[PDB]
């Protein structure tokens, strides 16, 4: 079998070649990037005498598709005219290659992943942490605008990138599952760690279920490790017990996929599902505290920021109590970014 006249590998990506020039314009350096979507190359714009992110979509019809709705995401965001388009990667083009769709971003520096890697998973600063805090709650705000009213649907470390390797301007990628409040398609969506209650669940989502990955986000990139870190779907919902506890009766009852995870007693109440011969592998409900995790008294997370200025015990209780409310079970009453952006943990020094 050849692929796409030889230009492509078995997986529908296009075979990248360090050196190459597109269309007289393009000269592609490396590949910088790769996913179920398909890749991403930096590359230097002749043309306008720059240097790019080029995401090259699969060679497959559903790729395409899907790919078709992220352009039309990024081009209505970047419409728009507020200054707060800026927390939201700039798509200057697209176009068509050797069948592939390509999309050319501006380039922007390394991810909040890489940056925890920097500082061998220590975490960064709290902060840092809230200047990451607010730029995103700000953003969550613009993508609220009614409208856009786009759901990100995959926040992750990996998607907030740094604008230049040495300032905390940070910029949202990624949105090729993004989807506005309308027109949702999918059931099993975010990342897994990030992955909210309401969509473990098979419920209905909003623009929520970005907050609770926002929550998740901000304490992993101060503790330096996922807050939520499940092997698959049962482990992530057992692993959010852990530190929250049965989530609400008046949610479960509606919830498509509570059996999955929960059982329900005579008298309606709401238990963990009953587990095999005992055996115990998780904490009781709500007792891996969020409070001892963030070490708010006891010197940070792990000890290590005890006697270090901008980490008083005022201040872990304000990122504490913000985070609590982003990662409320009911996505009715979970904080929303307007009032996230009033929240003490932001006031001014
Ligand atoms: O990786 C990126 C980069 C981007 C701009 C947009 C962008 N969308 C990405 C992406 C990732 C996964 C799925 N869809 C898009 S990665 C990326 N600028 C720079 N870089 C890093 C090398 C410094």
Known sequence: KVYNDGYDDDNYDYIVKNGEKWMDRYEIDSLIGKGSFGQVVKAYDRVEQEWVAIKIIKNKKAFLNQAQIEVRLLELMNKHDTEMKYYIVHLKRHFMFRNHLCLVFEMLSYNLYDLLRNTNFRGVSLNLTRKFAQQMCTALLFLATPELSIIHCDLKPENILLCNPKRSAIKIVDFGSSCQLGQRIYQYIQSRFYRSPEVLLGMPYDLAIDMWSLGCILVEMHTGEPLFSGANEVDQMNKIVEVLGIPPAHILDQAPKA????????????????????????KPPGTRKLHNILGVETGGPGGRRAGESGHTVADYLKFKDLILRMLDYDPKTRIQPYYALQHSFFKKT
């Open 259 to 282: 059996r999955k995870f929960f059982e329900k007693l005579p008298d309606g109440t709401w238990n963990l599902k009953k587990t095999k011969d005992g055996k115990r592998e998780y």
